[PDB]
Amino acid sequence: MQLTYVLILAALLFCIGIYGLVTSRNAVRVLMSIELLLNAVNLNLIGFANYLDGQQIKGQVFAVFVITVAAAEAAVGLAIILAIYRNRDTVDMEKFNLLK
Template sequence: MPINDALLNVGLSHYLILSALLFTLGLLGVLLRRNVIVILMSIELMLNAVNITFVAFSRYSPTANMDGQAMVFFVMTIAAAEAAVGLALATTIFKKFREVNIRYFEHLKG
């Protein structure tokens, strides 16, 4: 693929590559960070990458269909629910240990 063509014509692969990059960055954040809140933020990044994929496939499918965009709403709902529960868990950890480090999660049982 000539580099000029790739710069001029933005297509499906551009969006998929951006989505893959964003997903990988989010995964890196989930694995490397210790702060529970930053881990939740990285998960939001990964879900956004998935949303970009849905919308891009819906735009570039041979027949125009909006199913991909409908899926984005479900992903957003799940993301909001996950953020609410995760932040409630983070508050529980903070109340006990005055810190939101992921290593305190193991003390929450019982």
């Protein structure tokens, strides 16, 4: 239980979330991957606050804000997905390409 371990764990969670954000084909799974990424960030913030700045904890308030806004961005993203589904009638992210 050291700072380096928590940071490596957060970096690996960032890695997995990126893989899921780029590879996955369903449309809600990319949002879940974004949530994984934001958790990987909050873990960095709480590790730094616990080890470096332990008295006037400032990574924990920043983490509270990150959690708030991840909830908000999810609330907006599922709305965007419902809107696109109501018209295209699918969530296959390899069918939202109106280009060449």
